[PDB]
Write a protein that binds this ligand. Structure first.
Ligand SMILES: O=C(O)CCCCCOc1ccccc1CN(C(=O)c1ccc(-c2ccoc2)cc1)C1CC1
Ligand SMILES: CCCCCCCO[C@@H]1O[C@H](CO)[C@@H](O)[C@H](O)[C@H]1O
Ligand SMILES: CCCCCCCO[C@@H]1O[C@H](CO)[C@@H](O)[C@H](O)[C@H]1O
Length: 268
């Protein structure tokens, strides 16, 4: 048990070193306790335009694919963030010694099949029932606005809110999440994995570490560990549905570009 604390703290440090925003930072912004200035609320076309003229985005607008329409534009911003988060997750995983010890092709397999599950878990951190943070916490896009986008773009967004609000009710902190996300990435079930026994062994250790961490950090929280195992299963279903919806976008939205890295993740 005492051995897992060291293991856990290293994973937490990898998390702190590699992710742009913590849940702690996100919730302070969402509750209006973080700074002297509040996020700019994006809730319609006019405010989206004002945000693109005003807020500082990690990805410059000029850099996005040529403009098509509002729903597609919002989709392109979603892809921006997805790809950036894949980069952060890759570095997080590499800051974990037992992941970096795997052959590079298994690293790629784990990331390919794990990153969307991790993304949608981490998404909950910047979400509340009314919308989500964008542009490093400088903006807040309302759930209502995102609902108003045309199908298929509104359809691919709303189920993530449904998941997030339920996930946030578990009240995990950043140290819980670091272990949770590591367990999603270090998953021995992924297709085409070469060294399955090594990955299963690492996953098992992470989950033992997660169990012990939760007993210490959430001493009154009954059933939290099994609840999180179930959330892992729920994320797999969420990502299956997500991938199906992405296949439909590829089929029916032929004018919409998909980022080369995401094409490789979704290469069927
Ligand atoms: O599958 C892929 O990899 C790309 C396809 C993802 C499509 C589904 O993206 C969703 C769905 C639900 C909730 C959040 C996102 C995307 N997202 C975001 O952080 C995000 C959301 C909205 C905006 C935005 C900017 C201006 O107006 C709106 C910017 C960023 C986080 C998952 C990474
Ligand atoms: C940056 C980490 C995340 C990478 C995710 C993208 C993985 O794409 C896959 O790359 C493999 C190695 O090139 C190919 O053999 C596969 O066909 C392809 O699907
Ligand atoms: C083709 C559709 C493109 C939609 C917009 C996606 C842009 O994503 C950005 O592309 C860069 C180049 O890889 C990454 O380095 C950044 O991290 C990422 O934020």
């Amino acid at each position: 048990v005492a051995d897992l604390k060291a293991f856990s703290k290293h994973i937490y440090n990898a998390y702190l070193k590699n992710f742009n925003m913590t849940k702690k930072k996100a919730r302070s912004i969402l509750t209006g306790k973080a700074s002297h200035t509040a996020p700019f609320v994006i809730h319609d076309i006019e405010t989206l335009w004002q945000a693109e003229k005003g807020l500082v985005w990690k990805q410059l607008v000029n850099g996005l694919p040529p403009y098509k329409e509002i729903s597609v534009h919002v989709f392109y911003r979603c892809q921006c963030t997805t790809v950036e988060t894949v980069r952060e997750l890759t570095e997080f995983a590499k800051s974990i010694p037992s992941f970096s010890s795997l052959f590079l092709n298994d690293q790629v397999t784990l990331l390919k099949y794990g990153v969307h599950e991790a993304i949608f878990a981490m998404l909950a951190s910047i979400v509340n029932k009314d919308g989500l943070l964008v542009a490093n916490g400088s903006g807040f896009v309302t759930r209502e606005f995102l609902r108003s986008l045309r199908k298929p773009f509104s359809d691919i967004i709303e189920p993530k809110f449904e998941f997030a609000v339920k996930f946030n009710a578990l009240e995990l902190d950043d140290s819980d999440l670091a272990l949770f996300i590591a367990a999603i990435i270090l998953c021995g079930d992924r297709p085409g994995l070469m060294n399955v026994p090594r990955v299963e062994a690492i996953q098992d250790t992470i989950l033992r570490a997660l169990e012990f961490h939760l007993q210490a950090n959430h001493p009154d929280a009954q059933y939290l560990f099994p609840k999180l195992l179930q959330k892992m299963a729920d994320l797999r279903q969420l990502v299956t549905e997500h991938a199906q919806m992405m296949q439909r976008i590829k089929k029916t939205e032929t004018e919409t570009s998909l980022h080369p890295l995401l094409q490789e993740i979704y290469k069927d």
